[PDB]
Amino acid sequence: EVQLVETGGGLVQPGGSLKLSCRASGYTFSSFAMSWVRQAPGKGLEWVSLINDRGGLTFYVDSVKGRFTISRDNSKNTLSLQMHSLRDGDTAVYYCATGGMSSALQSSKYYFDFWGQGALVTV
Amino acid sequence: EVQLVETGGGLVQPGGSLKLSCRASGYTFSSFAMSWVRQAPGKGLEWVSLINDRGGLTFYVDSVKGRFTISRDNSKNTLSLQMHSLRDGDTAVYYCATGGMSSALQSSKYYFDFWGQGALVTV
Amino acid sequence: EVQLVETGGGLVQPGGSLKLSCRASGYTFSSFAMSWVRQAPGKGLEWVSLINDRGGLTFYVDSVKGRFTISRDNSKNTLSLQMHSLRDGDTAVYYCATGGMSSALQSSKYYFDFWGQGALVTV
Amino acid sequence: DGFLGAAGSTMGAASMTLTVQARNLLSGIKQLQARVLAVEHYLRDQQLLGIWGCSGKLICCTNVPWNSSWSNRNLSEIWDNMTWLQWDKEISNYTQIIYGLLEESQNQQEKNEQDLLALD
Amino acid sequence: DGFLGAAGSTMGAASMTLTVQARNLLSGIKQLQARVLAVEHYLRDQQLLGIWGCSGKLICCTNVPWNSSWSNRNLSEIWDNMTWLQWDKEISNYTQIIYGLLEESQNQQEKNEQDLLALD
Amino acid sequence: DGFLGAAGSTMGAASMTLTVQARNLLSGIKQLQARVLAVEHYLRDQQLLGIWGCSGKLICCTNVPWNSSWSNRNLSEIWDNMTWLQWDKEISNYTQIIYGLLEESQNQQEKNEQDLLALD
Amino acid sequence: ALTQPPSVSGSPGQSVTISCTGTSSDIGSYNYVSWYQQHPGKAPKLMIYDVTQRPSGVSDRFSGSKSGNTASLTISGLQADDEADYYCSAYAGRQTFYIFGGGTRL
Amino acid sequence: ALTQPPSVSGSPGQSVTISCTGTSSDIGSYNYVSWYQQHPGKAPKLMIYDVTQRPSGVSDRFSGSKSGNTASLTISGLQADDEADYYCSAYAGRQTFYIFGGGTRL
Amino acid sequence: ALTQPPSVSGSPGQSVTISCTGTSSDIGSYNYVSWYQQHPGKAPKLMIYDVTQRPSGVSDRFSGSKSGNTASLTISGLQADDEADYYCSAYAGRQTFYIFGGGTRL
Ligand SMILES: *[C@@H]1O[C@H](CO)[C@@H](O)[C@H](O)[C@H]1NC(C)=O
Ligand SMILES: *[C@@H]1O[C@H](CO)[C@@H](O)[C@H](O)[C@H]1NC(C)=O
Ligand SMILES: *[C@@H]1O[C@H](CO)[C@@H](O)[C@H](O)[C@H]1NC(C)=O
Ligand SMILES: *[C@@H]1O[C@H](CO)[C@@H](O)[C@H](O)[C@H]1NC(C)=O
Ligand SMILES: *[C@@H]1O[C@H](CO)[C@@H](O)[C@H](O)[C@H]1NC(C)=O
Ligand SMILES: *[C@@H]1O[C@H](CO)[C@@H](O)[C@H](O)[C@H]1NC(C)=O
């Protein structure tokens, strides 16, 4: 019953920007941390960004520390990612996932529990 | 009416030391942060060191972190810089400047407001 | 009258582990910090690890930060070092030494005061 | 919510309002004696926190491990399925041990920091 | 200068002597009652600072932004052309709002630190 | 050991039990007055530590150098061959100077930190 | 990144192991080594979490273990519907949160 | 350092722009991009501070702007006495305080 | 590491100096430059501690000094029994605790 639905963009050129968004259903949104995982068309998986359940602590992979902003709205059950510059090497499918962190009073996670289907971002 | 007057040295050889000094007039010395800016004879400008208005916080460019000491005397209206080692690449005009920092209760600066004429340091 | 006696191991292969131990006599064991110094068969001396007098603060040379564990037992007058991986470049004589640190209320040391004779560790 | 409004809330929810209870501890010889005693007890609690390395904090993490025998419940049962009133009863027989362990670990931490700062 | 000597000084100068006033807060039933009340008020001020994350500090920076409507004066007019007595009057109608904002921002900071420390 | 058990111990050994003495400071008008006075003196000592930048600490290092004239003994004689009762007598004539120096160095540290945090 | 074989295969009814290797600072330090199964054209799904624990709803044929700096996913009872790109991932501290290996085609 | 054209010129009575470029971590993060005018043989003087603000006493012909990671100094009404080596500089955080570009000869 | 001559020698009855050089961040910053004497086949023993201080029990013929980034061990009254591999070492802060030079054969 858990579902994450990507509503992303399309093709942009280097120097522009693109905002991705995911809608969540089937679980309490505010109870889980969420993250973005990137997969280039011909490559494997890599982690890009992590946001905690309250949207107060954010972490990024070094390659995007100065380019991407991750935010969430717990009343809308919406996760979003604002990506700047978008170079040729950033073409990939961007997946939302639930898991990756737990807010001290919850049991340990350190894994991605649920996955969406992925938005395709091209350059 | 604001004037900064350099009273520096001349030619030294590598491994020695040279002390530069600037006298200030036309403003309250203790009210402004001051800094040193270096310009090689054939190059552009670069920042070397910054001292705050009380002489308690000092910052240096990485290339001189282990070689230069910056100090000031607010009763004498005197800024001084003690330079060690002085390698061939350190030949330059050394300018005193007023600005570059503000002590939390003052409006933002982050610029060099007043300049002297510069001491010529050779190796 | 001060003596440090090494009771180490022999030859191991890469990917294994070896534990070294030193017994102390002639002084109060708990009153001095102790450390390990390594000397390859054809090279000079290098510092490997330092443990304070209470066994609560440990420091390692960068090359072994993820491989060696240093511990001491002040009731047994025993120092020990647990070494993992043990690559070909780790063949050396490992010496225990007394000195290298002082716990704030003691006079400064920053030197190795007493030495053992050394265990020979090969790969 | 107001003072003690979270008394029936779970621990993981009740902890959100610690400030509300903290602010209500300070807010005719018998009455003067009661006021002096209340001040002394407040200071005793602040001193007890101070000697653990928890000064200006309402939530303070420590380095004492949980020994399980004190309570072997799953973390999610304690924080989501218990109130603070019940928890205060389950471990009422172990608080002196925990307090002693916290005092000892703080003494060790302060001595180690004092020695660590001496490395010129 | 001495106790309250800076009362007529500007804010940016008066702040240099905060210790002088701080040390003068602690230094016959009616007199005993007055002393107990003075102690309670001292502790209430210390608790109020403690719940903001400002413990052993006389000058403490926070993460609450200034909303301008409280006072839209230039920073140099407030610190160089005003005394603390005047400033206490200009914003006397906004101190409860600021105190509430400080308490909330400290609660958020403590919870975020507790969660941040859990990342093994 | 117990309360004041370390009184005859050396300074470097006696410092191991600071908590034991710290916990014994808080633990009929004349008696009520004595209790109020004891509370005021406790708070005065805590305030004095607070204005030095030493809040929730029993051992606190500072940036005031030792001037030698206060006491020119070797560090090992002070910590291994002296008790705290004797030390309190050797430097009983210099504690006001040291306290003033500590207060000034804390004022300088707090102002420098406030300015350092402003560098956007 | 972790190193995985580029391809592991076998006949239906048999069993395979897919290894995952790293270093002593990540896979050998934190016991959080998860596995994902990505069918072509689909998002990955979680197969193993923690080190040896399986999510509810996932077949008992998928298991695993870890020793030293080597993790292994064991797939027993191979079926024709298990063809997927398998990935390992692990926690690597507070600076680098997750490190993934390359895909292994079954 | 910032990148500037090596030379910008025009006839008296016209106008030019002198660009200054950097990266997203400095010129595009902190809105503190100043400009200096250095006549040959003389120390530089401040022409623009903040991003678009001019010091008192400096002619209204000197103005500027910033967008993205690009700053620009606009000099209108070119005079023969404006020949100078122009420099841009910007704040770059608490580690690297100021970064300067190369000189642009008018 | 510190730089030392590979070999220093002289006839019995004479004197030599063994230099030790480093940089301004270690040997020239912390006044903790010790010397060790390692006879072949034996562990090193301490000859000089601090900068110029000698341990009790060590002959008065061994002395030393430091200036700038250069330390020197002076051995006077050379004897035939002083043949050893001499080493210098120094404290280098809280990150790199001790740095040793190469051996100098007497
Ligand atoms: C009380 O019980 C109800 C029903 O389980 C629950 O929703 C509520 O959160 C509990 N706590 C309070 C304070 O009402
Ligand atoms: C846990 O408590 C028991 C006594 O209740 C004790 O014997 C045991 O050693 C404790 N465990 C640890 C790890 O301290
Ligand atoms: C009072 O006013 C005078 C004159 O403006 C000024 O110099 C002084 O600093 C002010 N403050 C005090 C405390 O005298
Ligand atoms: C500033 O205060 C007003 C009410 O006085 C409020 O409506 C406004 O939202 C506040 N601004 C911010 C940024 O909180
Ligand atoms: C008292 O003196 C004895 C003998 O020197 C010594 O062993 C002991 O540590 C001293 N202190 C106490 C508290 O007994
Ligand atoms: C030490 O104290 C004396 C007075 O007792 C004073 O004259 C001297 O300046 C002090 N030294 C320092 C370094 O402050």
Name the amino acid, one letter, at G35: W
For a ligand 6 pocket test, name from F66, F67, F68, F94 the mutation site with the most ligand atoms within 8 angstroms of its C-beta.
F67
Name the amino acid, one letter, at E81: N
Interface test with A, best of D73, D79, D82, D87 (most A CBs within 10 A): D79
| Strand, coil or helix: A95 | strand
d(CA D105, CA E3): 42
Listing DSSP states for I38-96 in one string gives E-TTS--EEEEBTTTB--TTS-TTEEEEEETTEEEEEE-S--GGG--EEEEEEEETTTE
Identify the H or E element spanning C98.
strand C92-99
Instruction: Verify H-D touch: 3 or more CB pairs within 8 A.
Output: no
Shortest-distance ligand to the CA of residue F16: 5
**What's this structure's resolution in Å?**
3.5
Task: Give the tokens for residue G74.
Answer: 């064991």
State in Å: Cα C55 to ligand 3 middle: 59
State in Å: Cα D57 to ligand 4 middle: 29
d(CA A90, CA A61): 13
Residue D47 vs residues D40, D82, F21, I52: alpha-carbon distances, Å: 10, 29, 12, 48
Domain boundaries, chain C: 3-123
Name residues whose C-beta falls within 8 Å of residue G55's C-beta, 6 or more positions apart in sequence: A113, G46, G47, G49
Shortest-distance ligand to the CA of residue F10: 5
Which ligand 2 atom sits closest to the C-alpha of D65? 13
Residue ranges with strand state E in B1-123: 3-6, 16-25, 34-39, 45-51, 58-60, 68-73, 78-85, 92-99, 112-115, 119-121
Task: Give the tokens for residue G94.
Answer: 């507070």
Task: Give the tokens for residue F47.
Answer: 């305030």
For residue F50 and ligand 5, the question of a CB distance below 6 A is answered with no
In A, which residues are within 8 Å of G45 by CB distance? 115
Q: Which residue has the tokens 């921002």?
A: E105
List, as own/partner pairs, every contact residues A56-59 make where C-beta atoms lie below 8 angstroms and the sequence separation is at least 24, other chains included.
A56/E108, A56/E111, A56/E112, A57/E112, A57/E115, A57/E116, A59/G97
Asked if D17 and D7 count as a contact pair (C-beta separation under 8 A), the reply is no
From B4, B2, B8, B3, select the one nearest B94 (Cα to Cα).
B8
CA-based torsion, D16, D21, D22, D24: positive or negative: positive
Interface test with E, best of F40, F45, F48, F62 (most E CBs within 10 A): F40
Asked if E47 and D26 count as a contact pair (C-beta separation under 8 A), the reply is yes
Interface size between E and G, measured as CB pairs under 8 A: 7
Task: Give the tokens for residue D5.
Answer: 């409004």
Identify the H or E element spanning E86.
helix E84-90
* Four-CA torsion I67, I72, I73, I78, nearest 10 degrees: -120
Q: F117 CB near a chain H CB, below 8 Å?
A: no
From A21, A2, A4, select the one nearest A121 (Cα to Cα).
A21
Straight-line distance from the first to the last Cα atom of chain G, in angstroms, rounded to the nearest whole number? 20
| Cβ <8 Å between B84 and I25 | no
For B62-89, b/e burial (b = at least 16 CB within 10 A) is eebeebbebebeeeebebbbebbbbeee
| Strand, coil or helix: G100 | strand
d(CA G15, CA A76): 46
d(CA A39, CA I10): 70
Identify the bridge partners of residue G99 per DSSP, sorted by sequence position: G90
Residues in chain C: 123
Helix axes of E29-50 and F29-50: crossing angle, nearest 10 degrees: 30
Helix runs in chain C, H state only: none
Helix axes of D29-50 and F29-50: crossing angle, nearest 10 degrees: 30
Residues in chain H: 106
| Cβ <8 Å between C56 and D112 | yes
CATH architecture of the domain with residue range B3-123? Sandwich (2.60)
Structural Rg of chain F based on CA atoms: 18
**DSSP label at D63?**
S
For residue E5 and ligand 3, the question of a CB distance below 6 A is answered with no
Listing DSSP states for H59-88 in one string gives -TTEEEEEETTEEEEEE-S--GGG--EEEE
For E42-80, b/e burial (b = at least 16 CB within 10 A) is bbeebbebbbbbbbbbbeeeeebeeeeeeeeeeeeebbe
d(CA C112, CA C97): 6
This structure was determined by cryo-EM
* Four-CA torsion C107, C109, C113, C116, nearest 10 degrees: 120
d(CA F96, CA F76): 25
Identify the H or E element spanning H34.
strand H33-38
How many other CB atoms sit within 10 Å of the CB of residue F93?
A: 9
Asked if C113 and I46 count as a contact pair (C-beta separation under 8 A), the reply is yes
**DSSP label at G67?**
E
The whole-angstrom distance between B117's CA and the closest CA on chain H is 5
How many other CB atoms sit within 10 Å of the CB of residue H4?
A: 22
